[PDB]
Amino acid sequence: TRSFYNDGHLNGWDYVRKENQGTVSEVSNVVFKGTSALKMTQTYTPGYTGRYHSEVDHNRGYQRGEEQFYGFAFRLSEDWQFQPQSYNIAQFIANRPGAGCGGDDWMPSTMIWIQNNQLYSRYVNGHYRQPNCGRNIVTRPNLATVSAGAWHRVVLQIKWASDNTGYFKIWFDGAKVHEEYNVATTVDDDSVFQFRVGLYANSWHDDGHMTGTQGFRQVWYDEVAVGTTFADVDPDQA
Numbered sequence: 001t002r003s004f005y006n007d008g009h010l011n012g013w014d015y016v017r018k019e020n021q022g023t024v025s026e027v028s029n030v031v032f033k034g035t036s037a038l039k040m041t042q043t044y045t046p047g048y049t050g051r052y053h054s055e056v057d058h059n060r061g062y063q064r065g066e067e068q069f070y071g072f073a074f075r076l077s078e079d080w081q082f083q084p085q086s087y088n089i090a091q092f093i094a095n096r097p098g099a100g101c102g103g104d105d106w107m108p109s110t111m112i113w114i115q116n117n118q119l120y121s122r123y124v125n126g127h128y129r130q131p132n133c134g135r136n137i138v139t140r141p142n143l144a145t146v147s148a149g150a151w152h153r154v155v156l157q158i159k160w161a162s163d164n165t166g167y168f169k170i171w172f173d174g175a176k177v178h179e180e181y182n183v184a185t186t187v188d189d190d191s192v193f194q195f196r197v198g199l200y201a202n203s204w205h206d207d208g209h210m211t212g213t214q215g216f217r218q219v220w221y222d223e224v225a226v227g228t229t230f231a232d233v234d235p236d237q238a
């Protein structure tokens, strides 16, 4: 059964983040299903020292000790300029105030991004809380080649565990592209992580510069769902 469904509208998201010159809007011309989708844009601005999130938030993403499925459709601009930097397209993230690790208390766990023409993801495990900030980031590269100007469909099946009892499975355009079992997929606490979808141009800030010449970046989203079965969240079926 689905706990969340969004057909490509502003309505139903808890929060809309349009950092700096970013936009998030509803469009009817570039749509995966129905008559609406969301368009996220970000624009590089030399001098700016802040971050570049254009995202919509579903606050109830996960809590450790459950299995969930997540599905969404996304599309890069047809003229997407593939570059080695990261452009993040979805993430799970919790605010963990008082954890005392790193530069603030927001910790993204699993993230999904484009690097060159490849879909990357990761999960995080460990403790990341004083007096032990020990945490491990497992990156899973090259999950799929991503074509520009086409709707792609992503399904995740994740059992969120800090034990070696979790699992982490990903489908891309209807095909299983990754699965691994008996792994720890989140940190060992009970924070509730948000599920965000949207263009987060993280390398622009992290790296101190932009690689290439496409400072105006566009990604569309549609058909986002959270539920307990594959069919609940698969954008490619009802």
Ligand SMILES: [Ca+2]
Pocket: 007, 008, 031, 032, 033, 034, 035, 036, 037, 222, 223
């Ligand atoms: Ca739609």
